[PDB]
């Protein structure tokens, strides 16, 4: 009846990756008011659906972390992770760099130890 | 009970993965009826439970996908996926190749840029 | 006075992991009573969350496995699997090495072919 066809298939050699691209970039916002500090670290070009726990690591430059500034949120679908969080300025004292890490779950935890970071 | 036993473990010398072997093969079969085209493509040796989006790409190898010819399916558990579809023969009048890609999700974008391809 | 500072973050360079180190190690306690054998393989330093099928491979290394001894279990969040199994002694007669493997499914399956093995 209708014209048929039955081609055999052939593997391609350069099966290049597609989809979004891993290039950690970002801009932080350390807005400070009366005695609390809201911080909006907007990151882009991150990992499609990953967790990005970010806090304030004190001077130590692997040092201790004021864990009372943990912000946990997930990375959208193109790596558009937007972290936010309030912390009394008194706790913040002696913090030197806001380190962004990957997470193992929305319950904090540490997977990667410093994917992106900035002084203050 | 009356007899015990205690043995410390040793991690062998080399551990080898088993199950399916990623050997992409294929079998395209077109049957163009009255202003319509059915396409049953059988891919064996694929990735155990992956998505396999398939389209008819125009000339320009390289060139634009006729998006109205998408066929999507999963590869069972040994890497056997079967792609079926139905498209008017007027839209695929300039198709030069049927490119099979991997999928990111059920009905969605590509994760690769062509794993296996047959020339038409 | 909303003291606000905007800082661009650097893409880092040191991204070493943070969690269970895959270092397979453990012991075995095969205990015979009145014609039955109870085997307890407590492992540590394993994959954090993975099914670990373990059975008795006979002599022959390759060799068949008396599959009437498959001990299945999953690991915790540090990598601690506790395999436990009841097998008639007459069955495990002529067994040579208890081979632990990886489980593709809770139904069993040998993803890996021996991540750790103990001579019995």
Numbering used by the authors:
A (entry chain B), B (entry chain A), C (entry chain C): 20 to 79, 142 to 201
Quote from the publication.
The collar region of the SDBC was solved by cryo-EM at ∼2.5 Å resolution and found to consist of a single protein complex organized as a trimer. The protein sequence was modeled assigning 120 residues, missing a central threonine-rich region between the residues 90 and 137, which could be either disordered or truncated with respect to its ORF. Two short and disordered parts of the sequence, flanking the cleaved region upstream (residues 80–89) and downstream (residues 138–141), as well as a small N-terminal region interacting with the xanthophyll carotenoid deinoxanthin, remained unassigned (Leu6-Ala19). The DR_0644 presents a typical β-sandwich motif, with six opposing antiparallel β-sheets, creating a structure with a width of ∼34 Å and a length of ∼85 Å. The three monomers assemble into a trimer via a linking region of 17 residues at the N-terminal side (Gly20 – Pro36). Bioinformatic analysis by basic local alignment indicated the DR_0644 to be a SOD while metal ion-binding site prediction and docking studies (MIB) allowed us to localize a single Cu-binding site for each SOD monomer. The Cu-binding site involves three characteristic His residues (His74, His76, and His182), indicating DR_0644 to be a Cu-only SOD, a group of soluble enzymes typical for the periplasm and extracellular compartments and here unusually found to be part of a cell envelope complex, the SDBC. Coordination and distances for the assigned binding site supported the presence of Cu2+. The lower resolution of the collar allowed to identify and assign the Cu-binding domain but not to localize the densities for the Cu ions, which were predicted with high confidence by different bioinformatic means. The characteristic active site with the three coordinated histidines structurally confirmed the Cu-only SOD identity of this protein, corroborating the function of the collar region.
The S-layer Deinoxanthin-binding complex (SDBC), one of the main units of the characteristic multilayered cell envelope of this bacterium, protects against environmental stressors and allows exchanges with the environment. The crystalline cell envelope/S-layer of D. radiodurans is made by three different multisubunit protein complexes among which the main one is the S-layer Deinoxanthin-binding complex (SDBC), composed of the xanthophyll-binding protein DR_2577 (SlpA) and at least five more accessory subunits. The SDBC appeared to be composed of three main regions: (i) a massive β-barrel organization structuring the pores' region, (ii) a β-sandwich organization characterizing the collar region, and (iii) a trimeric coiled coil for the stalk region. The SDBC is shown to be both a photoprotective system, through the xanthophyll-binding subunit DR_2577, and a chemoprotective one, by the SOD activity of the subunit DR_0644.
